[PDB]
Amino acid sequence: KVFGRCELAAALKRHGLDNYRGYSLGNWVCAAKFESNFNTQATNRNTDGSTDYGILQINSRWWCNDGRTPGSRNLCNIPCSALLSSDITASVNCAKKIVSDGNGMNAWVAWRNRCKGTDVQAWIRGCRL
């Protein structure tokens, strides 16, 4: 499923992401935009052989099991395919663990390079939340 900007903002908010660990909603919507372009089915393979899954591009080396990443840790205890569902619950639950890992949202390279220090508020402007 390809989410709309305000649609995603609302789903993320309902799932407890607005201000989770100090990160306003705009940060999460901006990160989703650049990581997957709001597409739940996005996947991208990395050079180390791992793969990123879903709307938030969660990595198979540490967070989910895809059955093809030797040494994967599967910290979210879920098969990576669960992250590609139209229901964003698993992606959100796993992201909560990732952002709490100590490095905050810096764990997402697109957030760090394209959202961090920007007016992220623009991402939820005009939405009924």
- Angle subtended by helix axes 25-36 and 5-14, to nearest 10: 130
Q: How was this structure determined?
A: X-ray
The verdict on whether 87 is a catalytic residue reads: no
Three-state SS string over the chain comes to CECCHHHHHHHHHHCCCCCECCECHHHHHHHHHHHHCCECCCEEECCCCCEEECCCCEECCCCCECCCCCCCCCCCCCEHHHHHCCCCHHHHHHHHHHHCCCCHHHHCHHHHHHCCCCCHHHHHCCCCC
Catalytic one among 18, 35, 87, 119? 35
Residues at the annotated binding site for substrate?
Answer: 101
Q: C-alpha distances in angstroms, 52 versus 45, 73, 116?
A: 6, 14, 20
67 is written with which tokens? 């059955």
Q: Which residues pair with 1 in a beta bridge?
A: none
Identify the CATH number of the domain defined by range 1-129. Answer: 1.10.530.10
By CB atoms closer than 10 A (0-12, 13-18, 19+), residue 113 is exposed
35 assigned to active site:
yes
Resolution at which this structure was determined, Å: 1.8
Exactly one of 52, 66, 87, 119 is catalytic; which is it? 52
